[PDB]
Amino acid sequence: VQKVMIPPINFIFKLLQQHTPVSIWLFEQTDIRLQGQIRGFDEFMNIVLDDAVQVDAKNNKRELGRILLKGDNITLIQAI
Amino acid sequence: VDKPRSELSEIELARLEEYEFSAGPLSVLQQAVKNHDQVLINCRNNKKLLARVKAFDRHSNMVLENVKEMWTEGKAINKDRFISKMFLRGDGVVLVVRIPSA
Amino acid sequence: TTKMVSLLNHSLNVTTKDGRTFVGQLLAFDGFMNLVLSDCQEYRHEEKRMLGLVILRGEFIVSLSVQGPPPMLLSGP
Amino acid sequence: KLVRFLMKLTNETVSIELKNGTIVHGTITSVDMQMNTHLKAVKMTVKGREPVPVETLSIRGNNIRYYILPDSLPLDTLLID
Amino acid sequence: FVPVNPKPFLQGLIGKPVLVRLKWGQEYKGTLQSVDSYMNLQLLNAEELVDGVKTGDLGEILIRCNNVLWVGE
Amino acid sequence: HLHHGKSALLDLLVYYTHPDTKPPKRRSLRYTDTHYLERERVMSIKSTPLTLAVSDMKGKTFAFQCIDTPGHVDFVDEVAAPMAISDGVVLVVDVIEGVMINTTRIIKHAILHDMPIVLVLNKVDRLILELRLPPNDAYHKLRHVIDEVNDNICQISKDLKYRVSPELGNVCFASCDLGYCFTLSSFAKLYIDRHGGIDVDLFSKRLWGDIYFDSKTRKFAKQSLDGSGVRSFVHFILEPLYKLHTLTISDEAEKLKKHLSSFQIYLKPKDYLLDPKPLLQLICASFFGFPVGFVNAVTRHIPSPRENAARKASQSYIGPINSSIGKAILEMSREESAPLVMHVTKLYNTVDANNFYAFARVYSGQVKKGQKVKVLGENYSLEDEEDMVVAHIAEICVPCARYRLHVDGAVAGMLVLLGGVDNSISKTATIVSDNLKDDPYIF
Amino acid sequence: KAGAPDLKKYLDRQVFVQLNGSRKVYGVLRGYDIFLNIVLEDSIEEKVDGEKVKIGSVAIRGNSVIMIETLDK
Amino acid sequence: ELDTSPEDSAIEEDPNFEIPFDPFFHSEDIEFEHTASALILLWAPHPFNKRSGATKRAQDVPLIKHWYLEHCPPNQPVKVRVSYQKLLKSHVMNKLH
Amino acid sequence: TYRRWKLNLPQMANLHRLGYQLLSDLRDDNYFYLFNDNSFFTAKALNV
Amino acid sequence: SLCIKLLHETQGHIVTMELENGSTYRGKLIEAEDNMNCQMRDISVTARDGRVSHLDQVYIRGSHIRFLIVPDMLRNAPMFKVGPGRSVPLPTRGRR
Ligand SMILES: Nc1nc2c(ncn2[C@@H]2O[C@H](COP(=O)(O)OP(=O)(O)OP(=O)(O)O)[C@@H](O)[C@H]2O)c(=O)[nH]1
Ligand SMILES: [Mg+2]
């Protein structure tokens, strides 16, 4: 009746397959947030994003295209 | 080389280490060592370093000689200090830019 | 790291990344140089605080120095 | 390895810039492969603070910013393995 | 559909002009030609776009791995 | 039971805590015997208490107040009496001999008295070196012994609280002669430390009955259709143990040396040229260090005295719980103002048979030497107030079998030997402080 | 080498996570990694003012996790 | 009586449980070439279960002491039984003092 | 001086095989129940 | 290592620890790991400014620890010699 445990790597793999857009947070930049569709990751979860947009507190969305985000900065991963 | 797999033993790790220099970005250190080119350093405390580079480590640990180190900060006033020889831990390096001697 | 063993039971003052200073007697250290200090006093800028037995993390430590020496034939024809 | 260059040189006077901005000046006793430096008869000058002398002191490897080395060492031979 | 891993992504980008962003608000534009496994990179004829404005030219660049925030374009 | 190895279990800890002691020439150490008669018959006759500090699986050090007991049938005094002032029973069962009549009696009386039981399957090495059973049949023998113990438990109370099985961490496999006593979790941790990061509890819970490991899929099947896999316990525990024993015994110096070098266990060259049994002991002491599995199992499955105060008061004490003395017993208060309540169930001979030491568990309050206490007999009550005897407390000691530690005072939850108060005590007695509220009761 | 953190008792329970930079996230813990990377479902974020936004499914990097808290008796 | 055995309870929780490492001694076998003889020697009488000793003198080895330390074989003449008994008596008298 | 010996496993096994007529076959010690030294001392003391 | 051994020794007592924030925690330690992840009970948090709050169950990550104030009577805890391979400081009886 219980539910099995889902490791974070498998969760991010599920996000990769489902093409669910995400909202990545940053290590210390509270205001700066990134959104987009995920495209790749590694064991260190250096995340390769597609159609990346840099959203700020007042929604100053700036297009960045496809970018690679170093894992040292990701604080949080959002599901839409 | 066809071994970036990152699962290696000591001899192939050393081969990959030497290739990380011979073609990697740290290759800039070798021709700076052999050409005795001017190299400018940006430290993580907003420091400017320019000097000859003599030897470097994979960690970017660098031995420098004849260093001209400047810093700016009353009103913003730029000041300079020349020191003979340096051992700089590659931990604090942000950037290197070479001034060609030629 | 053999020299580090020579500092056992000595009185040490350790400057931290915060900037404080802990003074006390060393009990045991670590490979990451986690320190165990007995009868520890705190130097917060100077203010005095009794702490007691304190385990410092390796990251927290910046520098350390000693302040005191460690507390201390049969016959013939 | 290059940290070996550190241990191959010993008991010379060296000024040291730590991580926080403090300057210490003294002769090294022994340094480690892991960059733990041991200093004797040194002059500890904390940033913005009055200089204070201590008989010995040791620094963690992550706190070393750079070294002020003397002019009396055969560096070319010193660098050889 | 086809996922692209970080290292294949960047090695399939060697020689292209890119905008790398540091952890602290500085963006550098230039072309890269060589990278090792630790994802620290080298640029050629690069320029710093501080606050989005072109100030000076630096030439070739080597950035340490930890300073960078993202790489793009 | 008799000669199942319960004194060797305590010798295993004594060898580690007391570096001075050395094994005898022609027999076992048999620490906690301490009687020339018992050294003559080579069997325990008296229940000698032993207090020593042992180390937990993680590094924590506890203070085990273990009481050794005889295994002979006629000496069940020294099991029933000391058990009334203990929190649990560690049952040592020989795997070769199996469950015997005294083991059945001990199990019945422990479950009847609500006593948690920790099972130690001793003399495992006799399955490898004497009986020469194959690993699978050895597993079957171990399982049968555990099932017999569980049956003996079920004959009294079918509660699931008293159920011994390795996956609960309640059963330790030991060979006290060779000097090892591990559990599922201890051996699992000994894998984990070597081979990286995997949760010890999850790994250890999958090392028992008919859970099969598939060497190609690296997964735990359930039935292993045909011969796909071998039993997890045998694959991961018994086979490595057998191979360790055989490498030591079978005179393979180079192979054993290489395997120990892989574990960073380094022996002097003169050590490989030893007698087979001391070489086995050396290898097992280097491979399996302190018996941390037994300590961890005891600490986890036997309540601490503070936690067991309520159960002890409900079972042993006969007076009203709501009274001040009953509240003091329940809280196990240690302050001086609290009443002093202790239960003496045993008397022990001095080195010369002149005076007796009373073996007491301090249920509440504090005690200092020279204190005035009032001794209550076996049938002291409001009807019979003439069983009271006023006595002083000459000396308080912490027992260690072959020596004593003298303490100026003791606190609640401690088992101590009292000198100077033995004349009024026959069999058992209750000791309470004289300056105390009215109406004292006896255990 | 590394070691698996003990978080089996925290699974499938309403939890509060404190991230770096004065962040705070609700949620039900659903998984964890060696480096304490945690996974949350139907979670809720707190802001400095105090109003709660539904934040959703969350996969926190273990580097930034300060504390993990349960509230039940 | 258990509703669900601990076995299915353990397997059912994360049925995809994975451990990469092998058992300790994997390349070896539980029995080597000399294991049988070693076991035979392990439970042998005193001289032959050692592998290390101290070279007693030639006359300090009795070689037949166990013959009369044990019981006398049955169906022997009276003189043999008496010889067994007298030698045992001498040994006992030696051991007593 | 010929004061200490160390033998292999095959050597000890072969010596045990060769001198097989002159060594006991008990390995139990429960065989000597009332026929060991202390019982003999008791019997001598009691004159039985 | 001896320091993590002492930290494990502390479990069950009341230990005060402060993190990289500057807040100090006063509670009963119930679990500890080699990473120095800690589980606590009945915490009385004193903020950096001085605000006092209360917590019931926390799981503090080890990497965010500055130091701990272990109860004093653990000064006499034994510091065992650690061999090369051993990962827990325990009494030894073999070669080393
Ligand atoms: N082969 C083998 N023999 C063992 C082991 N442990 C104990 N023994 C032997 O068991 C016999 C009895 O050991 P004791 O420690 O006196 O057992 P005991 O339970 O204390 O005996 P009692 O006190 O009379 O009940 C001795 O011959 C021990 O050498 C073991 O692990 N393996
Ligand atoms: Mg006994």
Curated annotation (Swiss-Prot), chain B:
Domain named Sm is located at 26-102
Q: Report the sequence similarity comment from the record.
A: Belongs to the snRNP core protein family.
Q: Which organism is it from?
A: Schizosaccharomyces pombe (strain 972 / ATCC 24843) (Fission yeast)
- Whether Cytoplasm counts among this entry's keywords is yes
Protein name, per record: Small nuclear ribonucleoprotein Sm D2
**Gene3D superfamilies membership:** 2.30.30.100
Query: Could you tell me the gene encoding this protein?
Result: smd2
Lineage of source species: Eukaryota, Fungi, Dikarya, Ascomycota, Taphrinomycotina
- Coiled-coil stretches are none
Among CDD domains, the record links this protein to: Sm_D2
Swiss-Prot record, chain F:
Where's it found, cell-wise?
Cytoplasm; Nucleus
Region annotation (G1) ranges? 1-7
Region (G5) location = 223-225
Map out region (G4) in residue numbers. 122-125
**Where is region (G2) located?**
42-46
Which residues hold GTP?
A: 1-7, 68-72, 122-125
Q: What are the boundaries of the region G3? A: 68-71
**Record-annotated tr-type G domain positions:** 1-254
Entry similarity comment = Belongs to the TRAFAC class translation factor GTPase superfamily. Classic translation factor GTPase family. EF-G/EF-2 subfamily.
Reported function: Component of the U5 snRNP complex required for pre-mRNA splicing. Binds GTP.
Could you give the subunit structure recorded for this chain?
Belongs to the 40S cdc5-associated complex (or cwf complex), a spliceosome sub-complex reminiscent of a late-stage spliceosome composed of the U2, U5 and U6 snRNAs and at least brr2, cdc5, cwf2/prp3, cwf3/syf1, cwf4/syf3, cwf5/ecm2, spp42/cwf6, cwf7/spf27, cwf8, cwf9, cwf10, cwf11, cwf12, prp45/cwf13, cwf14, cwf15, cwf16, cwf17, cwf18, cwf19, cwf20, cwf21, cwf22, cwf23, cwf24, cwf25, cwf26, cyp7/cwf27, cwf28, cwf29/ist3, lea1, msl1, prp5/cwf1, prp10, prp12/sap130, prp17, prp22, sap61, sap62, sap114, sap145, slu7, smb1, smd1, smd3, smf1, smg1 and syf2.
Write the protein's name: Pre-mRNA-splicing factor cwf10
Q: Which gene encodes it?
A: cwf10
Q: Which residues of the full protein are shown?
A: 149 to 591 of 984
From Swiss-Prot, chain G:
Q: What does this protein do?
A: Plays a role in pre-mRNA splicing as a core component of the spliceosomal U1, U2, U4 and U5 small nuclear ribonucleoproteins (snRNPs), the building blocks of the spliceosome.
Q: Which Gene3D superfamilies match?
A: 2.30.30.100
Q: Which GO terms describe its cellular component?
A: catalytic step 2 spliceosome; cytosol; nucleus; post-mRNA release spliceosomal complex; precatalytic spliceosome; SMN-Sm protein complex; spliceosomal tri-snRNP complex; U1 snRNP
Residue ranges of domain Sm in the record: 2-73
Q: Note the CDD domains from the entry.
A: Sm_G
User: Which terms does the record give in the GO molecular function aspect?
Assistant: RNA binding
Q: How does it assemble?
A: Belongs to the 40S cdc5-associated complex (or cwf complex), a spliceosome sub-complex reminiscent of a late-stage spliceosome composed of the U2, U5 and U6 snRNAs and at least brr2, cdc5, cwf2/prp3, cwf3/syf1, cwf4/syf3, cwf5/ecm2, spp42/cwf6, cwf7/spf27, cwf8, cwf9, cwf10, cwf11, cwf12, prp45/cwf13, cwf14, cwf15, cwf16, cwf17, cwf18, cwf19, cwf20, cwf21, cwf22, cwf23, cwf24, cwf25, cwf26, cyp7/cwf27, cwf28, cwf29/ist3, lea1, msl1, prp5/cwf1, prp10, prp12/sap130, prp17, prp22, sap61, sap62, sap114, sap145, slu7, smb1, smd1, smd3, smf1, smg1 and syf2.
The cross-references to InterPro entries, in alphabetical order and at most eight, read: Lsm7/SmG-like, LSM_dom_sf, Sm, Sm_dom_euk/arc, Sm_G
**What keywords were assigned to this record?**
Cytoplasm, mRNA processing, mRNA splicing, Nucleus, Ribonucleoprotein, RNA-binding, Spliceosome
Name under which the protein is recorded: Small nuclear ribonucleoprotein G
Q: Where in the cell is it found?
A: Nucleus; Cytoplasm
Q: What Pfam families does the entry give? A: LSM
What are its GO biological-process terms? mRNA 5'-splice site recognition; mRNA cis splicing, via spliceosome; mRNA splicing, via spliceosome
Its chief place of residence is: nucleus
Curated annotation (Swiss-Prot), chain J:
Q: Where in the cell is it found?
A: Nucleus; Cytoplasm, Cytosol
GO CC term (a single one)? catalytic step 2 spliceosome
Q: What's the main place this protein lives? A: nucleus
PROSITE patterns (UniProt xref): SM (PS52002)
Q: Please report the name of this protein according to its UniProt entry.
A: Small nuclear ribonucleoprotein Sm D3
What GO biological process terms does the UniProt entry carry, in alphabetical order?
Answer: mRNA 5'-splice site recognition; mRNA cis splicing, via spliceosome; spliceosomal snRNP assembly
Q: What does this protein do?
A: Plays a role in pre-mRNA splicing as a core component of the spliceosomal U1, U2, U4 and U5 small nuclear ribonucleoproteins (snRNPs), the building blocks of the spliceosome.
Alphabetical list of CDD domains matching this protein: Sm_D3
Family the entry assigns: Belongs to the snRNP core protein family.
Q: Supply the alphabetized keyword list.
A: Cytoplasm, mRNA processing, mRNA splicing, Nucleus, Ribonucleoprotein, Spliceosome
What organism is listed for this UniProt entry?
Schizosaccharomyces pombe (strain 972 / ATCC 24843)
State the superkingdom. Answer: Eukaryota
Name of the coding gene: smd3
What sequence ranges are listed for the domain Sm? 2-74
Q: GO MF terms on file? A: mRNA binding; RNA binding
Q: How does it assemble?
A: Belongs to the 40S cdc5-associated complex (or cwf complex), a spliceosome sub-complex reminiscent of a late-stage spliceosome composed of the U2, U5 and U6 snRNAs and at least brr2, cdc5, cwf2/prp3, cwf3/syf1, cwf4/syf3, cwf5/ecm2, spp42/cwf6, cwf7/spf27, cwf8, cwf9, cwf10, cwf11, cwf12, prp45/cwf13, cwf14, cwf15, cwf16, cwf17, cwf18, cwf19, cwf20, cwf21, cwf22, cwf23, cwf24, cwf25, cwf26, cyp7/cwf27, cwf28, cwf29/ist3, lea1, msl1, prp5/cwf1, prp10, prp12/sap130, prp17, prp22, sap61, sap62, sap114, sap145, slu7, smb1, smd1, smd3, smf1, smg1 and syf2.
Q: Which PANTHER family match?
A: SMALL NUCLEAR RIBONUCLEOPROTEIN SM
Q: Does the keyword Nucleus apply?
A: yes
One Pfam family in the UniProt entry = LSM
Q: Which InterPro entries match?
A: LSm4/Sm_D1/D3, LSM_dom_sf, Sm, Sm_dom_euk/arc, SmD3
